[PDB]
Amino acid sequence: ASVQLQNVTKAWGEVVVSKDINLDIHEGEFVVFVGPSGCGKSTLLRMIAGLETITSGDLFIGEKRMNDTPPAERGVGMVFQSYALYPHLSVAENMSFGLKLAGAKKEVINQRVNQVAEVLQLAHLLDRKPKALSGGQRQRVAIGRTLVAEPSVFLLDEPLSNLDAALRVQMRIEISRLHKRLGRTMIYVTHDQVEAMTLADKIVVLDAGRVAQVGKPLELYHYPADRFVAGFIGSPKMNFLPVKVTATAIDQVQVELPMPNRQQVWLPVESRDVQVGANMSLGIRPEHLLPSDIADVILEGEVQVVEQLGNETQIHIQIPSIRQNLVYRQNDVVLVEEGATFAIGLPPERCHLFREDGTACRRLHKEPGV
Amino acid sequence: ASVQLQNVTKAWGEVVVSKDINLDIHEGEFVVFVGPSGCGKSTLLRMIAGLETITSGDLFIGEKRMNDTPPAERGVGMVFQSYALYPHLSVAENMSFGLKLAGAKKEVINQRVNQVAEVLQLAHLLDRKPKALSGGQRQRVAIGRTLVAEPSVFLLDEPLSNLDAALRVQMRIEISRLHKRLGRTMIYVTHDQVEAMTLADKIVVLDAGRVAQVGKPLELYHYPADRFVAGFIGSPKMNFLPVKVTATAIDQVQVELPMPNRQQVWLPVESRDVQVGANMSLGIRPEHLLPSDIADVILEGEVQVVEQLGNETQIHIQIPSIRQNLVYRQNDVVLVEEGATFAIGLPPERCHLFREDGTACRRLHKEPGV
Amino acid sequence: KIEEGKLVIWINGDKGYNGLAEVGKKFEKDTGIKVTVEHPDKLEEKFPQVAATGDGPDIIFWAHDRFGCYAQSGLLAEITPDKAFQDKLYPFTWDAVRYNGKLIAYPIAVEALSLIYNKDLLPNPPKTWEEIPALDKELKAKGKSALMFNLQEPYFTWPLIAADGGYAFKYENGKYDIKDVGVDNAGAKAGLTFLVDLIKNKHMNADTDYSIAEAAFNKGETAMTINGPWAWSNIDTSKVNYGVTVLPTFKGQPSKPFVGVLSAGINAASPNKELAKEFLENYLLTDEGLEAVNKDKPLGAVALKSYEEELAKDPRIAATMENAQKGEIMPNIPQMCAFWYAVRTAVINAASGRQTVDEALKDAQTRITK
Amino acid sequence: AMVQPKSQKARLFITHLLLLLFIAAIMFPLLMVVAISLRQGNFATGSLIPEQISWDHWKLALGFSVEQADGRITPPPFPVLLWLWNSVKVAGISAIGIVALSTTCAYAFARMRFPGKATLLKGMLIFQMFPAVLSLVALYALFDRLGEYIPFIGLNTHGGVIFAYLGGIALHVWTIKGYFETIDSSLEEAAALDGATPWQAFRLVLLPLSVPILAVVFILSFIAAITEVPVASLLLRDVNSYTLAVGMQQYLNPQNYLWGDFAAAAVMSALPITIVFLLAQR
Amino acid sequence: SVLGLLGLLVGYLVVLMYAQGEYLFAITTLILSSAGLYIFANRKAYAWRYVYPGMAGMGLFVLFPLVCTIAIAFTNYSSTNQLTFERAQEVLLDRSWQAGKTYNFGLYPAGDEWQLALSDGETGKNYLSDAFKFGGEQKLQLKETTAQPEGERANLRVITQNRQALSDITAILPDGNKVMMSSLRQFSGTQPLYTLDGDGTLTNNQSGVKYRPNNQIGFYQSITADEKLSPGYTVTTGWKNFTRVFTDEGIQKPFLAIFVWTVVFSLITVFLTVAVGMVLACLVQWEALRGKAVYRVLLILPYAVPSFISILIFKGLFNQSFGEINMMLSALFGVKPAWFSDPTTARTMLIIVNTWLGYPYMMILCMGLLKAIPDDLYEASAMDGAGPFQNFFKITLPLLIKPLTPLMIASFAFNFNNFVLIQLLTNGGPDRLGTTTPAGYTDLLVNYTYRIAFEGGGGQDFGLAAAIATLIFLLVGALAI
């Protein structure tokens, strides 16, 4: 009903993938773990489920230790990454398999399946087998199984990962509507940052088995705690510029751009633990860059790519003195041909700053929604 | 090099999976086939490649007929959906396998391998076997393989489809920059509409075998030929409102809204072959919708879902008398809680209209980009 | 453990087992005890194996020569006929079944090989071995052949070997001297060399067995064969016009076939020794019982005096006795069954051409003694 | 389904002839038997194709006596049908027993963790490499002491011969384990979370998905026991209890070579294994 | 519930295993039983429940007869030395000599009770017993009479029905001595040949010669104040059979030579059966082929025919001078190969027959194993322009040999000890010249050791064969390390 992890550490022989990680998940909270493939998303979910052993640490589910408790008695229900649909059994039997064994209730089985099959639209596919269904239908069956189970905790391991793009958008709504309806604890796992940002009440970002940041989606977006978090959230990747600190002040930090026109801007950012001459990274999102006529800190270069998305326009610009393309993003429609010269404004208020060790300097600018 | 299809039809005994469909693909053109799973995308690609026979019609590559020509002699390569990497062979052996058999040249192999391994950063993986590589690397070997072969026509069956969202976005840029660097004909297959828009010179939309529309990405966005194209292209799905035709003019058409408050508005659209009292569909995109204080056509309902994306805010509104939550889209951050009342503006200039069968009425509103 | 209350009898397959069974049915009719007759393959080997563990048949049938080995191994019970019964058989047959002053089996019938000739092809059969090659050429051009007999067993090839002066064990006045063996001497060599010379001149095949010989004569392909009384029943069926005559002479000296006496012993492990006595003495060894067996497959010249005089009028049996007189009686000493194994190996390896007659016999000579 | 090069038929036609000649080369021996089984007389030598049919050899295989014009009614020399049913019993029961023992054991080897699971399987295979033929001395003594206590599985019993084969499972255990390690782990894990005990997962999840491998293991074991000779003919002593393998070698007595009678029984002996193949189309 | 009922047999069998001797088998019967109870009872050992019934079969019917067969090697187990001492004397005590003369007996009913009558032929006098009841060992004193017994003589059937009770009746004459039933019609004086006193010394009753158990050779032998009684018994000899293998020149001679043939025979079997098996498995599943399903059943058919009957029909087919293969192999060509006489031609035949025997199993295997290769690997190969041959050697073969290796090293183990093929077809083929033991050219290690023990003539030493059987297996124990 309320899972929480204290000093949790997973190890394989000698390799310590995850160090002591602390997580507290409230009742009815929708928590999404995000990170790249092979960062330990499934493992965390498996350790909560009891399919994987916790090497060192304490695991509580509803104010009681669960480490050694067998998976079946954990009050937990998992939607597997593969769907784990029994190939020999029908859709009806796939969803009812839990309450089929260990105390059969013929009358109840019929009811519990049909109630769940109604709210997923699986009524005409009950007597069908997993091979006859499509990937989109198979997903709903896998979720159905746990919906029939009605556990206190849900564990969804990339439930949208294998679906079509258009079907992946549709199902996101079906998930959020199901969450507020059931009002129960949900631990969600995905590589897609979009799913984290839309569905979650609280996001946990994972980097090489390490928790990089925990907080609300909008907190993660506006105030990342390190370079990794900043570069993991947001439609296109945040822009990063190698800067050198030239001066410091309690209220803001001044850095030097790597350009031949060595411009120096004051950034409203925590001066805490930053030294002059220290090489750092300037963070700025494609959406936050302004048209040249607005600002005074200008960045000019040659257009490499023009991506006409229809609803917006994404523009990749080669700025001399930095061999990473500056990505620009503008609403509606912008008529710029590839190879043309393009200038944009770099707004100091909307900038992130990261130390050598990638740790973020706390932004002192107040963004709405946090 | 120039690949063209005349009345190409695929059948499976009795199942006509693809109608007689014509396609003209010019030299060096980046063409993307898009559609939902099972709409016949891979069937088409395999018919071009020679991996599937053509039941009816003619196919030309470089202006000679290929229907009965074996796959190898078509001057065509393919990156397979599953990568189709030889499990027993190394990366260097996977990449060179093509020209390795028949016309083997020891010194020429080394060149073409190391050159393609250079542009894909695969020089350190050449001695490795596919099982040791990550999914993302294996994709680069799959593309790398055909790049070594240097075909006149590239056929790509969902190359990005099995990658992390952040790695998928990054790989889009690589493909674009590979396209312009080579300047050769590329046929691309995906289900993601985003990939179609950002890669294609020309888009081909497939609906259950049938070609729905062909043209520029920015043309497909503004001017769809039917309800399917409109509903398939665009970040979130386009809003469809059942409307009733009440008045018809030579310039525009007036329709009635399904609200209890029966409002009526003129839409600058085609009026050739239209009838009064015909149940039609109103098309309006989430981005095009306006704030309530600006426009005159007002729609008011109850907010169900609020998705805080950071770069934009998407709001799902329960409008009365229609069982479809209307989707709104706006920049930056919008401070509106779930459950609260909200009103938006409907602009007639950015409206689409569809017939009972689903045929779109030709938009007369001049858009920038065509 | 041999079962009590029934009689299991073992007899070689080339004897009249079905007839012997008829005797068993009469014994069953009078006593109420079932007689099972069986004809297992390689009987001479199977019995010693099974009997040693106290298993096998109650009554065992073979020629007397093997019975000495059986008696020494403790496999045979001493049979106990009174004065009145012994006087019913010929005294020289009781001498064949005597081992160490004790009677170990009931002698049934005297056996001896004779030359069997096809009258229509050969009205005047050869009196000499020397005139067969000349006769073979005559018949070979006619589409037929002179002589075909079993070469795989020494029993069939010993007459020719023992003609000029071959012998098993030199019988001194009293007992068999087991250190003087005549398989190495000039006489034995000359005979076996003649056989090899018939093969080397294509008159015979080195690998001609009993099955092929019986086939060739009964189908009228060969004019002559060398066989025993048991084989006449098959020749009758084939309706071939045949005679039975003296064996041909080698180097003036007559062929000397080893004379066997079909004998019935009682297993030393039978719990039916009393019933076994009654069957053999009062059922088998009567005019009726012997007729039943002889009518199936001829026994030859029987040991029972009463039936012998009925049977002596048959010229076939006269010729059987004529050849029996010219040969000598087979010894029953335990070294006799070890005599056959070496001569088997010697003859087959000499006939094949793997060894010269001189080398092939010298190995056998040093094997019998040891 | 893929466009084909160089006229295709150049290789396709020449393949049809090569297999067509190959099936002829391998069917020949079997066609000989069928021909010998219809040829009159029991001789070892005869005409390649019979001049006239006989039926006689098939009559005594099925249990009927025949009347040759010469010496009255000759009875069936051997109970071939009984031998046939005997072989089916011993191999059938034998094969179910082998499947049950080897399938359960492999399930523990593939899934359950217990120390020294590698060495035990290694040891199982090495020990099984030793031929049963060089153990007949000890095997007879084994079923001799075992027979006086549990009579239905001792010497001269089918149960004894079945229990004798029940040892050879090491090979199968490996194969079945290998098959189990191919099935997706998630299915048993999803069963565990549903509450299923390790046995419940074995029966309701793993077994029904392993039908084809267990089918192969059965067919292989069934074939193996149908043709076993050394042990079978060592333990089975009574003619009426012989399996085909034991009994069928009584036909070819060098001095009573019933080559024709044998042929009819030989074709009949192919029936059980073929019956199995024909039912194993699922 | 079931623990107690299965616990009942632990004590109903276990205790009786200790009784009636049988110390050798009483040990392992408890060790295996007590391990089964400990595993299946408490739920601390659950993984072993799936393993135990498997290894119990392995132990009883594979591991035991092997350990036992190694124990056979330390003794002189022979065709002569075959039984235990207590079984040897049991045989020797059972045999009996006829002392007294024979009498003709009759069975005559007198109410419910019976009456016996004998008749001496020498004197002509007749004797008749008093009325008696059949059952148990009883003695009847016969009395001379001139009269006939009342009630008709019993027919054979009736006397046969009462045979058991009649055999225990030991009648005795007024003048002679004891006389027992000898047949359904006769009575004769049959006394036991030997008597066994306090010590294990058998003494003869006809000759009077005493015999004592000589445990050096394993026989009862005559002692003086040399005859050897020859049922014989099994007695330990230690390393004597093992040393003979390292001492003899005529046993070692072919021993190394056939080892070469054994390995060469099985290597060539595996190679040709895999080749033929795989090539056909590829062809039967080949899309372009027409009657795939018809070809599939036909190529499998050889396997639907038991091995032993195939070998037997091949044996007759491969005959040298006659036999249908050479009949047509001399019509064309003109040669009649020496399939049995020649060592090589025989060895060739074995392989031809074994390939015929062994290809269907490899085909079936490759058919299933072939499905592990995804189709699109051949589609990617088609783009690059590979022919059927190129596909086979660069893709198919190397991708099949890995999952195939363990099954073909198993095939090597099978065909290493393929006893039934050799025994039935050739039984050693051509004979190996000048050997102390029976040996052939086509004999395998299993065949050679079998010839040493079981083949009649040329010695039947089960012990020597057991020593070589152990010596092979322990040296195959190098395949472990």
Ligand SMILES: CCCCCC/C=C/CCCCCCCCCC(=O)O[C@H](COC(=O)CCCCCCCCCCCCCCC)COP(=O)(O)OC[C@@H](O)CO
């Ligand atoms: C000693 C050998 C004895 C053989 C006895 C078998 C008797 C049967 C007679 C047939 C003889 C073969 C004649 C060749 C005819 C060409 C057949 C053909 O052209 O048909 C090919 C069938 O493949 C195929 O067996 C490929 C063709 C196989 C040819 C290779 C044969 C060489 C065998 C020697 C190698 C030894 C193996 C080593 C094992 C350790 C077509 O393949 P593709 O469409 O490209 O592949 C893709 C598909 O398979 C995808 O599923």
Ligand SMILES: OC[C@H]1O[C@H](O[C@H]2[C@H](O)[C@@H](O)[C@@H](O)O[C@@H]2CO)[C@H](O)[C@@H](O)[C@@H]1O
């Ligand atoms: O050939 C060796 C063999 O010779 C004799 O066997 C004869 C037998 O006596 C005949 O009755 C008939 O069955 O043919 C046999 C030969 O095939 C000896 O009797 C026997 O001991 C010996 O092994």
Ligand SMILES: OC[C@H]1O[C@H](O[C@H]2[C@H](O)[C@@H](O)[C@@H](O)O[C@@H]2CO)[C@H](O)[C@@H](O)[C@@H]1O
């Ligand atoms: O290879 C020759 C051999 O093949 C078959 O033997 C199989 C056996 O049937 C299987 O159970 C398994 O153990 O593999 C063996 C060979 O690898 C035939 O059964 C047999 O006739 C033939 O000799």
Ligand SMILES: [Mg+2]
């Ligand atoms: Mg995962």
Ligand SMILES: [Mg+2]
């Ligand atoms: Mg596809």
